[PDB]
Design a protein. Structure first.
Lengths: 289, 284, 285
């Protein structure tokens, strides 16, 4: 059957999503995960929760062992990963309190281990060139959107709905993220350049987590929590740590509701062909073979 | 009391701007700084000078230990840092021989240690998320512009003056820089792309120096020397002009130190320190 | 005094361009190269070939030791380097099966050793700031283009010819590449941003290879093989890539012959003089 890993960002250190069955420590060919993993059940759906930044939020986005976290969830038999990401908005219609079910990204990270395969010692032998045109699992994306509908959260889809139909607080049914390396926030100059490229939000944690998930043969979807307008607007709306966590409290209640419904909706369907296609995509991407 | 640190770039490998009182061979948690630090006074204002690339200019931009350079100045009690940066112009009105008091940047560096904090080698415990919307100390920026005026150098502010005020050589009162990693210069393709993004100049050394200065609680301002047009558009004349630009910048730096020491900075220093404290993600 | 090195990418992990005269297992001051280097002759012209990814194609683009590859070729006496690079098209008129003799690039790589000089122990002493406005050797570019003409391969020059004179498959007489770090391909978002910038193709291996070749005082030119459209827009592509490899081999063999047919004394002089004039450490400025 299925088993859903949850990767919690800011505000989701120990989200108490179910009734904790146990705590498990996993070892990985790529090092230790950010923390031990909490195993349990949402309904009768197996679920495991892993905080991205560890215990007391001591691991910055740039130094998170994304390889170990994803592989640990794969090792425990996860078929899916749902992840949360706090983010700043680059557009007027994405406002604090909204959420975004991302479908695209632009990568500006560096110095992070972004692949399981290579020639280095602590890498799997081989060369893996994975396609990433649409880098998320689309079925799992639509689960997150449907979970929002089931919880009476407004859903805004810019592909068919105009900006006059956008009703806050809402889940944006698509969106593109630029992932910066951190730990600093962007300059106004960088923020305007990203905006001019058409990007919707900026975060620090999406990449390479999303890429490694696909490399691992797992279905991955992310829901971003809009906490601020980055720094392209007026000075009082400029992002800081205080502003990011201030918006978060009312949002985490709704995000947790979305995540819990999504896990149940995943367990209500058959994923046999999707899981097989995920694994076959990894094999067809090996260019050493 | 104020104490002004100066980080000298290309053309300032061993400036000797004042009668030196002493020299400090220091070390920091993040390693050795680029060279010995030279101590003296401009009037009654204490001043410390270090060459970004070392006395021999043997250290390329991506291998400069920016963390050690900023922290060594912090350890000596510096309240300000003034820095020079040689650059290429991406825009028609910024010509070789001009200067730019930068107020913005777009970062394309990689592989450099750009934060004092983390879970990394030598890094301090914690997670620091500094706001960087306007990344310089604005008071110190205006002191640089004011020093240029008192040195009879034309000041051009495109936001507030007409085109006819752009008389060369001039100090541009604002501007944005793309910081590339080096050591190679840009291709024509890259230069065209950076120009289309609206950037004013290209350089190799501003980042992470400016970021670490804010992390250290110090007021930072940069004055860039336009040394040529980047390749979106004879070397004996360019070299002679750069020598004149170095003379102009030495005089701006010396005047700037005196202007800084004429004002009180208690509030700004405390505000710099408080911004660091409120940026600790692990503590909130 | 002329000797042509060849760096083969995808489709050239086991090149077999000429009869192997000698097989060199070399080391460099910057590590070992991707594989043994094979020496031989194309006609009377000495030649050296090296698979960028190794025979097993086990080395991904970001882990290739570009320093060692370029330096090993130079240590063996090479004056030129011809390189192949598989790529995706970002433009309508560059169709799979076409080739591109590149003249420009935009670099989005990171974490790769991109210079021979510096202050670390595994680098040469000094600070080298190389100009790169037109980063390839123009004479060698034109030899690749002329080689395509001599082998009856269409050449499309957008500066000279009409857009309807673009007959496929063809060698494009110019073009710009974005080099991404890999190993993953681009997202649709990134592909559209790159296309919006005006870039022609996307690849993973051009940089820092082209930059190190100029640092080494060598004439470098690249021929890119369009294998697909990038995602702005399995067997039929494999058969199309098989045909592309055959015609790229023909271009490479002909280009070596054309290089050996001319005098390069002044060009080589200028290559070496550019390295020396680009030193900015003060005791060797
Ligand atoms: N403005 C911002 N930039 C990057 N990451 C963020 N996380 C929350 N707000 C952010
Ligand atoms: N064109 C240029 N690009 C980058 N750094 C420079 N320093 C001086 N000129 C430069
Ligand atoms: N689309 C693509 N992107 C990067 N490298 C490639 N090599 C072949 N096709 C490619």
């Amino acid at each position: 059957k299925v088993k859903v890993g949850i990767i919690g960002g800011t505000g989701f250190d120990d989200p108490n999503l179910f009734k904790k069955v146990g705590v498990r420590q996993v070892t990985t060919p790529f090092g230790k995960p950010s923390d031990t993993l909490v195993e349990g059940f949402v309904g009768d759906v197996a679920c495991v929760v892993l905080p991205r930044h560890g215990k007391g939020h001591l691991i910055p986005p740039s130094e998170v062992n994304y390889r170990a976290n994803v592989w640990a969830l794969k090792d425990l038999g996860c078929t899916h990963i749902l992840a949360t990401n706090a983010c700043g908005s680059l557009q007027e219609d994405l406002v604090p309190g909204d959420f975004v079910v991302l479908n695209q990204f632009m990568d500006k990270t560096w110095g992070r281990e972004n692949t399981f395969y290579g020639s280095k010692p602590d890498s799997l032998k081989g060369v893996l060139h994975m396609p990433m045109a649409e880098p998320f699992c689309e079925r799992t994306r639509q689960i997150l959107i449907q979970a929002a509908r089931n919880k009476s959260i407004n859903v805004y889809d810019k592909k068919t709905m105009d900006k006059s139909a956008c009703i806050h607080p809402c889940v944006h049914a698509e969106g593109s993220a630029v992932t910066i390396n951190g730990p600093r926030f962007s300059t106004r100059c960088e923020s305007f350049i990203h905006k001019a490229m058409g990007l919707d939000i900026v975060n620090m944690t999406l990449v390479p987590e999303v890429s490694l998930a696909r490399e691992a043969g797992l279905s991955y979807a992310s829901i971003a929590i809009v906490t601020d307008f980055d720094c392209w607007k007026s000075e009082e709306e400029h992002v800081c740590v205080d502003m990011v966590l201030e918006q978060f409290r009312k949002s985490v209640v709704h995000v947790r509701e979305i995540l819990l419904e999504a896990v149940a909706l995943i367990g209500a369907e058959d994923w046999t062909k999707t899981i097989e296609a995920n694994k076959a995509l990894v094999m067809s991407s090996r260019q050493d073979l």
